[PDB]
Design a protein around this ligand. Structure first.
Ligand SMILES: NC[C@H](NC(=O)c1ccc(C#CC#Cc2ccccc2)cc1)C(=O)NO
Ligand SMILES: [Zn+2]
Length: 302
């Protein structure tokens, strides 16, 4: 019906230029509109023939420093920040073209991506938006790390970090964001990625974080933030972990109706939670809404 929560795509094709956080290679990003029930599909246009990797949990390869999409030997690195923007603005179908193996880091947040998508405009499609509603509690744990899916009428993200560093200890360790009352754009999207300088030195030698800089990452010592202009939020470190979680959870293919709880969790435990959820079919269901007013999740005007 006309009053249903409709599927969404881009209104126009938008282009952006940047560098890969871990590869350091120059990359041309092209966001394009896609037909109904396509989902988010990544395309390597630098290869002949063009290789397409759908942004799904089954196509997740490595989860060391970032979330990587793999198809054979073709890779698409650091997809979590762009997928966070797609999820936050409710983009159902989109073609993501890349001229290199990694998504541009931009400023280390989802901020420029949310602006690039909203500048291009949103288009409502003649199809019902599919939602994955959490019925039962699903949790994955490994040592002192845990990732939980709790039933909730709407969408809520909770995260708890525990870094033994004065700069991290001196800041907020836990944050709960309810997207029915809080804006993804205003409070989450701007949270930049963070890294330890002494840890980044070992990574740069081991062919990782090659495109890392103070302009696209929060560089930290023991007591303070090395960035001249400081932080964007007092709780920016835990807000970025929430941003990363929203992006990782969007690999389900559909928007979530439930609560996510992250306890020192990362990209590996986030993918392991999705795989355990998909495997436990009694714990979830596919739901559509014929009336947008009755739904527990609302979206920004197209
Ligand atoms: N743990 C969360 C994870 N963080 C990173 O992947 C990450 C890795 C490395 C760096 C870095 C850096 C840097 C630098 C730099 C090096 C030399 C001179 C100036 C800056 C930041 C975040 C993340 O946000 N993944 O999406
Ligand atoms: Zn991140």
């Amino acid at each position: 019906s006309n009053a249903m929560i409709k599927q969404r795509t881009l209104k126009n094709i938008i282009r952006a230029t940047g560098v890969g956080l871990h590869s350091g290679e120059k990359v041309y990003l092209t966001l394009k509109p896609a037909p109904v029930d396509t989902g988010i599909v990544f395309s390597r246009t630098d290869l002949d023939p063009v290789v397409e990797i759908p942004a799904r949990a089954e196509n997740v390869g490595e989860t060391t420093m970032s979330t990587t999409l793999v198809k054979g030997d073709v890779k698409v690195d650091t997809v979590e920040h762009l997928l966070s923007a797609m999820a936050g603005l409710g983009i159902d179908n989109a073609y993501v073209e890349l001229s290199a193996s990694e998504v541009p880091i931009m400023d280390g947040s989802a901020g420029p991506f949310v602006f690039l998508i909203q500048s291009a405009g949103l288009q409502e499609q003649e199809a019902a938006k599919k939602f994955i509603r959490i019925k039962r509690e699903v949790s994955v744990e490994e040592g002192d790390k845990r990732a939980v899916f709790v039933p909730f009428d709407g969408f809520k993200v909770s995260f708890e970090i525990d870094f033994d560093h004065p700069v991290f200890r001196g800041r907020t360790q836990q944050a709960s964001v309810d997207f029915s009352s809080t804006s993804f754009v205003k409070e989450v999207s701007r949270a930049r990625t963070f890294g330890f300088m002494r840890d980044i030195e070992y990574l740069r030698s081991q062919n990782l974080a090659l495109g890392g800089s103070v302009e696209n990452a929060i560089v930290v010592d023991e007591n303070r933030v090395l960035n001249e202009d400081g932080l964007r939020y007092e709780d920016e470190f835990v807000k970025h972990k929430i941003l990363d979680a929203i992006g990782d959870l969007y690999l389900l293919g559909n928007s979530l109706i439930g609560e996510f709880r992250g306890f020192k969790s990362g990209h590996a435990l986030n993918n392991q939670l999705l795989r355990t959820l998909i495997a436990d079919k009694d714990a979830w269901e596919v739901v559509t809404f014929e009336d947008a007013r009755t739904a527990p999740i609302s979206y920004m005007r197209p």
